[model samples]
Target: MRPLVATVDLSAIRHNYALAKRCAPQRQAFAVVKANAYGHGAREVVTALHDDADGFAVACLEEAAEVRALHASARILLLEGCFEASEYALAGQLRLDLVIQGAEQGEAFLAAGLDIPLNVWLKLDSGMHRLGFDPAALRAWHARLRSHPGVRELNLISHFACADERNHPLTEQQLESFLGLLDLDFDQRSLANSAAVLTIPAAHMDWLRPGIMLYGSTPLADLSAAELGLKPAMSLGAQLISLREVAVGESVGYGATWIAERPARIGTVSCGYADGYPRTAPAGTPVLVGGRRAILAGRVSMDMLAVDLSDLPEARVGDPVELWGAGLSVDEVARACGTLGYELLSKVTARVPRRYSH
Candidate 1:
């Protein structure tokens, strides 16, 4: 009955998976459904692309376990690996792939030599400077890991710092560094994140791990997921709760951020920061009202926002207001907020109900 609702199109999820496949025809794809498939609902997202994805990836063991519980046979990879030594055995028991980035994880693997071997991905510190070992350190770690009793298969993995910048030197430098390690005989290699999979063709080596792109957002300026034929999988909608009129110099919302310059009509929409709409989005931010673009009139509250409906005299209560997705692009809205579509999607609060459509 509430105005705030998020509809997920499973068909779009499937379409994006296929689009990613087309981007790297030769390599296998690991559909990234972490952060609830970038807020599209992980179970439904996995259902849509289960057959297409060779594997899946998440940020931690808990997320990996959730995916495994829903889809038992899904090959899920833990990107951050285990923070504690106790998790190594848990990872093996759940049949999840573990990424080892340091000597401590390597030691844990040796200690947890369980009956079922564990697939391990080695993260290399190419240029991101986040997690991972240097090329020389990785080689030495690999040599030790190869003999570990619990080790099943070895893959090379790294995150791209600047794949969105087509001309950025770091992407090429990272790629060159990653490529240099291939002669050592690894089972598989993964360097493509959302930006790399969509823009940098050379980064698609063996396994493509696409996150934001699969949810219909782009990480680069020159390209959009739509241009690559990927469909938007999430539609955030709300309803016009009330309509009113204000005189000249009258304020609309909190702190008097938006004052009416003249006689103006205002419409209240039942969505705000608590529902994932950005609070920082200033006055005049676009909102789809009665099937047309309307300007936001005031500062967003915890549960609602006011919109300037002066131009839409016919606009009334119960009109649908699209926050993003559907006809409006989430990427465009995120740009206006100085953020990203991924953050917007993933940050949608639990108060809003999610409905999945196949």
Candidate 2:
């Protein structure tokens, strides 16, 4: 095997999920395992969390089905709901919860006329302006669904546009709009994502939906995961395949983007863009060689990338290099690459093997 591996700490995931529960002690939580648990391998995550998670949430019916197949009695929520009406039958068969974001979905449910009632999450626009109904429409839908035979338990849900931005005015505005609607009626409301779960205590309604934070990345830019008491779960690593001494003025990797200022030792890692390392990662991005900090020395290739081992004189071929984890934060790496941790974590390609550690 190629020595490139993504080591996932399942205990860290459970700890983070426990943090979410602690944050919202009074409410239930849907462990948002959508996008294959943010590319940490959904099956492993679901298995680790099966006994403790109040419920699991996924983006589509397919993901919900995958989790349902694992834990038959666990509550599974379809965050995006079904794309077509016919899928509702499958959802019912799987006993999955659905999110009704627009009139089209609400109408679809009414048309289905299933004998059993379905658990529904009514999504309100709440200023996000994506995948939800407007306040007026939501109010009407709430009234209609409350009385509809197809609906069993109706809940409220909304996404935050700036909840990660500490003290952002938009988060306050969105919260106010959502809370105002709650006065009309209330069933089980969920307004907090990973960010809100940590910062917005008042928005912790009847249920909390936490996604990224559970994976050990800080949802807010102003705070680190350690400050939030979260531990890193996925530690990506690869072995140093080769080492070479590059003379001054010698360039490394494709595009010749990096030239050695002086003679430097360069280590090539057995992983690269095709393995989910960001291709845009510029020179000087932090990596770890033999647990010591190093920096990128060249443009990333599909199969490999060169790292400056000048700081680690003893580094050698076969030494393990941490792409992100342990001493280095994925968020820090993402920042260096001008992206968010979510993108890096969720975009880890299937080529790399994931080794789970409990």
Candidate 3:
């Protein structure tokens, strides 16, 4: 096996789920396992939190199908509704809870006439404008499908664009917009993502979608999932594949973006862009070498990265290095790279092996 691997802790996932339930005690907690449970392994994550989570929310029908394969009676919610007419039947066959985002989905639901009415999440555009319908469109869709034979349950769903930025005015605006639409009369509603679950209690609706929070990653700067008593489920690590001694003024990696300030020892790690590590990650991104912090010394390559081990002469090949997880956080790494943890995590290539821990 390669030295590079992603280690997932199922116990951490259970702790995160408990934290989410505590955060929104009044609301049913739906663990968002989209993007492979934020790169922690969706099927495993569901299995880890199956007892605590009221339901599982996945990005598409395929993810939901994967959950069903693991737990036949698992309550699965598809965040992104079926895309085409053909998918509607597949959703029914899979017994997935479909999110009715627009008239198209409503029409598809009514048209399907499946053996059983699928549970529905009535999505509203609110302010994200990425998905869902406007208030009028939502109301119309609701009215048309509220009593349709293919509809089993109805809930409202919306996303917050600025929930990651604490005290951002847009958070308030999105909340107001989503709350205003609640007047339309839906059985249940969900307006919170990971950020809202941590910062905005007002956004917690009948059903709370805890995305990043459930993985112990905080979307906001001021708060951490750990501070909220959640555990981090993924701890990514790799061995020092190679080591080099660079003379003063010598350049490291492509474009020579990082020039050795002094004579330094650079450690090469066997994980990089191909493994979903951020290429745009700027210099100084922390890499834990030999259980200590080392600075990323150069541009990330397809299968490797250069880390300045000048400060840690003791570091060498086969030494463990953490990319993010456990003691270090993906959020911190993303900040240094001018990106988000979600991008870094979800982009991990399939070639990277995944190891699960209790």
What is the clash tally of candidate 1?
0
Task: Report the poorest 10 consecutive residues by lDDT, candidate 1.
Answer: 221-230
Error of 2 at 310 (Å): 1.5
Compared with the true structure, all predictions reach lDDT values of 0.85, 0.89, 0.82
Better of 1 and 2 by lDDT: 2
Q: 1-358, model 3: which lDDT tens digit per residue?
A: 7888888888887887787788878778788889888887887888788677798888887788898888778688888888888888788888898887877777876777687777888888877777889888887787877777777887788899878887788788888888787567677888888778877898888788888877777777777656767677778888898999999898999998899878899899988898998887788888788779878988999888889888897776899889988878887888788887777778777898899988
- Over the stretch 213-302, how does candidate 2's per-residue lDDT look in tens digits? 899999998999988989999999999999999999998988788898998999999988998899889888999888888899889989
Given candidate 3, what's the lDDT at residue 29?
Answer: 78
For model 3, the local distance difference test gives: 0.82
Q: Alpha carbon lDDT of residue 192, candidate 3? A: 84
Best by TM-score: 2
- The sequence of per-residue lDDT tens digits that candidate 1 reaches over residues 95-124 is 998898988777776677678887889999
For model 3, the superposed segments whose C-alpha errors exceed 4 Å read none
